[PDB]
Amino acid sequence: GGKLPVPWPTLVTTLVQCFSRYPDHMKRHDFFKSAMPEGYVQERTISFKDDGKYKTRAVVKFEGDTLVNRIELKGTDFKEDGNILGHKLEYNFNSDNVYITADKQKNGIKANFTVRHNVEDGSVQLADHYQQNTPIGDGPVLLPDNHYLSTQTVLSKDPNEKRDHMVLLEFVTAAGIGSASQGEELFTGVVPILVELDGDVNGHKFSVRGEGEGDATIGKLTLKFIST
Numbered sequence: 541g542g543k544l545p546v547p548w549p550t551l552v553t554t555l556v557q558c559f560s561r562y563p564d565h566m567k568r569h570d571f572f573k574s575a576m577p578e579g580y581v582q583e584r585t586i587s588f589k590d591d592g593k594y595k596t597r598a599v600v601k602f603e604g605d606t607l608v609n610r611i612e613l614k615g616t617d618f619k620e621d622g623n624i625l626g627h628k629l630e631y632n633f634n635s636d637n638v639y640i641t642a643d644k645q646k647n648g649i650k651a652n653f654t655v656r657h658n659v660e661d662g663s664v665q666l667a668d669h670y671q672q673n674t675p676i677g678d679g680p681v682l683l684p685d686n687h688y689l690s691t692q693t694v695l696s697k698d699p700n701e702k703r704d705h706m707v708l709l710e711f712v713t714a715a716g717i718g719s720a721s722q723g724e725e726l727f728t729g730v731v732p733i734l735v736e737l738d739g740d741v742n743g744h745k746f747s748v749r750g751e752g753e754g755d756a757t758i759g760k761l762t763l764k765f766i767s768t
Contacts, residue, residue, distance in 0.1 A: 542767060544746050545742075545744035546739075546741050547629040548631065548706040549695065550588075550594075551739075552693065552695075552708065553669060554611055554737065555609070555763075556609050556761065557712070558754075559712070559727070559761050560756065561757065563714065567719070568682060569682060569684035570682055574681045574720070575675040576601070577726060578601060579599060579677075580674060581676060582673045583596065586669050587667070589667075589668065590622075591619055591665070592624065593615065594741070602726065606732045607731050607734075608733075608736075610735075611737040613737060613741075615739070616742065617742075623659055624741075625744075629659060634655075641686050648681070648683075649672070649673050654666055655668075681721075685717055686716070686717075687717045688714070689713070689715075690715050693710040695707070698764065704766070704767040706765045707764050708764075708765065709760075709761070711758070712761070727756040730754070733752050736748070748767060751764060752764060
């Protein structure tokens with residue numbers, strides 16, 4: 541459970557958009573819940589400008605009563621003295637707008653957004669995200685019109701936790717445009733969450749386990765992550 545080779549803020553987006561709050565008038569555009577319980581594969585390339593990149597693949601699905609996110613992450617071409625491997629990022633997380641568009645060929649969606657990480661010297665470290673989600677099951681899914689997800693996040697610590705860890709609380713709401721899918725109805729209450737990540741960045745291997753709960757009615761995620 542040693543210290544991660546990368547800053548916790550750089551892993552936030554990799555570490556379950558099915559918990560976003562879709563307002564009633566937009567429920568017909570919620571691909572993420574409609575893919576449940578069989579779930580979807582979520583893949584990203586995250587390009588840290590003037591530095592390296594992460595490539596991720598995750599399976600997000602229900603196991604029993606729990607929404608599970610299992611991720612493999614590979615980071616390459618990082619500068620050992622850069623903002624990421626040098627741990628120069630502040631422990632906070634700005635609001636993002638995640639822009640979503642349908643990918644009819646793959647019966648899924650794509651998403652694009654650029655995260656701004658605050659650097660300890662007042663500069664900014666950009667992380668450009670390219671994302672694609674493909675449903676695992678064969679059933680019908682909701683393919684959305686163009687819209688975005690607006691996010692808000694607080695990062696904190698557990699004063700009694702000796703391991704390297706991150707406590708996270710986030711609220712996400714859809715914007716920019718009865719149940720609309722069967723999968724939507726799996727999110728009506730509070731749902732337990734398990735996150736497992738295996739990572740390798742420039743050959744530095746690490747793993748993260750997270751547990752918590754999500755409440756999609758209000759777009760809320762609360763989780764605690766530990767380096768394992």
